[PDB]
């Protein structure tokens, strides 16, 4: 008659892993729901103890896998601090939607070799909060009267560790856009604040 807590701990690189697949699935679902891509062509998986929208665009599949591992890297070096997905029009390309994710890492993870008290339960349910939240957010995002495309902006403070194919670019603000913040979530190593900017409606 006994049991036992056996807490595993957390790592720099484990945080990077989990938050990477976080953004993976979150981006999947965002670009699924608002209509950005062919919804019909997608499907569902089980992750985070819940159900998730997953694509089949081999193009975007490999692309975002590259992005995922590269972010895993830059987290493992705390390199990036912003992650944004800017959605715009097709031809005139005017920005309609801009999901900003502002990133906190752990420099002390250099010396923070010993783990930190926080459970897969806790992190998992908090990302579930995030996911369900973003999902809900569709209930008020002013619908896209057209079809759209999107571009991927980040901000790593270092202009230093830049791999080959990535190029420097511009800020890409919006003139008349409201910004609304979502719940926060962290790892005690990485936190990510989240807030969507979206073009203020022309007419009420």
């Amino acid at each position: 008659a006994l049991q036992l807590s056996r807490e595993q701990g957390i790592t720099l690189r484990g945080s990077a892993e989990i938050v990477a697949e976080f953004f993976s699935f979150g981006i999947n679902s965002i670009l699924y729901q608002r209509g950005i891509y062919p919804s019909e062509t997608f499907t569902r998986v089980q992750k985070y103890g819940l159900t998730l929208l997953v694509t089949t665009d081999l193009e975007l599949i490999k692309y975002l896998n590259n992005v995922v591992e590269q972010l895993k890297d830059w987290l493992y070096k705390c390199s990036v601090q912003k992650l944004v997905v800017v959605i715009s029009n097709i031809e005139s390309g005017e920005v309609l939607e801009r999901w900003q994710f502002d990133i906190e890492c752990d420099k002390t993870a250099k010396d923070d070799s010993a783990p930190r008290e926080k459970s897969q339960k806790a992190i998992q349910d908090e990302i579930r909060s995030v996911i369900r939240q973003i999902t809900a957010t569709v209930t008020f995002l002013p619908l896209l009267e057209v079809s759209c495309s999107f571009d991927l902006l980040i901000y790593t403070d270092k202009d230093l560790v830049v791999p080959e194919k990535w190029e420097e670019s511009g800020p890409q603000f919006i003139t008349n856009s409201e910004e609304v913040r979502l719940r926060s979530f962290t790892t005690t190593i990485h936190k990510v604040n989240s807030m969507v900017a979206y073009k203020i409606p022309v007419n009420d």
């Binding site: 975007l60 495309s149 991927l152 790593t156 202009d159 511009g170």
Partner: peptide, 9 residues
């Protein structure tokens, strides 16, 4: 910083 790749059509 602000870094981009090719978004497929």
């Amino acid at each position: 910083k602000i870094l981009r790749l090719s978004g497929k059509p």
